């Protein structure tokens, strides 16, 4: 994350660590569902022009963690994988559609106080609160910048931006699927994701009931806190009948 | 590694 | 059923230092 800050303890209790064995690092950020499932993006997992294709035995989950490299002993909790579901009309060879994967935790994880899920949104949810200007959070171990790593996990804060917006910042085809965020050149904040934040969430707290709902997953974007670009973010509820598919079959 | 070792039992 | 409250803000009717930002931006 750029231009964020050091995230409070217990801020985001639903973080999750996706980590690599052999050679143990960060592999990507995720987020707790529920006690045996864990949401990230696809691209995390699975993407052929980076030759990435992690199976369950190359990765371990870290759920409650807040140093990014420290054995948060007591703390944190350490999950292995049953298995990998991902979109299967993820569309890696051009934009990053259906940028998202479920992974199926071989044992339940005791929520504590720095473990716990986060809600998916249902349809009213997305209509009341994905709309242009309304902020979510991001949050994630990854780069401090483009071109550097952070002790502590790292937040921000970012608008979501109009859809013509978006589609203007890239040569990218930009769907329905996707939606963008971040601060625009005059505005004068800054702020997005970089490199190890892809498959964390970008979370809203309900106005309405008070809940925190992962809206999105972050997805790619042109760099990092590029002056006229923004990050896109894969459309949770868009994707929900997948999910629910996916949870209700396995 | 940057990162501190995982206990034994999860590797 | 209790999920997106968190043990240590929500639970406790604590705020976090920047959540309020959030909320303005719901207008
Ligand atoms: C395969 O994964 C990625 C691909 C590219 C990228 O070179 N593309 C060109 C080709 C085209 O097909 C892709 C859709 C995009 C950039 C990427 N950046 C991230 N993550 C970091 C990050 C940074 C800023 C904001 C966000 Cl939300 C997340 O992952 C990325
Ligand atoms: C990824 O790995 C799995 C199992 O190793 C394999 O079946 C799949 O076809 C691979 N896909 C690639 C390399 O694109």
């Not at chain 1, 569902?33 to 992690?54: E, G, M, Q």
């Not at chain 1, 004068?188 to 490199?195: V, W």
Request: glycine content about 8%; some cysteine; aromatic content about 10%.
């Amino acid at each position: 994350i750029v231009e964020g800050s050091d995230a409070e303890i217990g801020m985001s209790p639903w973080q999750v660590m996706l980590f690599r064995k052999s050679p143990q690092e960060l592999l990507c950020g995720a987020s707790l569902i529920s006690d045996r499932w864990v949401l990230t993006a696809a691209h995390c997992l699975l993407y052929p022009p980076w030759d990435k294709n992690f199976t369950e035995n190359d990765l371990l989950v870290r759920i409650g963690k807040h140093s990014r490299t420290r054995y948060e002993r007591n703390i944190e909790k350490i999950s292995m994988l049953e298995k990998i579901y991902i979109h299967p009309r993820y569309n890696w060879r051009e934009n990053l559609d259906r940028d998202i994967a479920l992974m199926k935790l071989k044992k339940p994880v005791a929520f504590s106080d720095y473990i716990h899920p986060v809600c998916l949104p249902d349809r009213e949810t997305a209509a009341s609160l994905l709309q242009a200007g309304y902020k979510g959070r991001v949050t994630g171990w990854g780069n401090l910048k483009e071109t550097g790593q952070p002790s502590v996990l790292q937040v921000v804060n970012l608008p979501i931006v109009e859809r013509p917006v978006c589609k203007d910042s890239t040569r990218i085809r930009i769907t329905d699927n996707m939606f963008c965020a971040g601060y625009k050149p005059d505005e004068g904040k800054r702020g997005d994701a970089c490199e190890g934040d892809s498959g964390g969430p970008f979370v809203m707290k309900s106005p309405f009931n008070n809940r925190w709902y992962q809206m999105g997953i972050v997805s790619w974007g042109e760099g990092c806190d590029r002056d006229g670009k923004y990050g896109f973010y894969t459309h949770v509820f868009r994707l929900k009948k997948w999910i629910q598919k996916v949870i209700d079959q396995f | 590694g940057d990162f501190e070792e995982i206990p034994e039992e999860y590797l | 059923a209790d999920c997106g409250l968190r043990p240590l803000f929500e639970k406790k009717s604590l705020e976090d230092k920047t959540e309020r930002e959030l909320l303005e931006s719901y207008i």
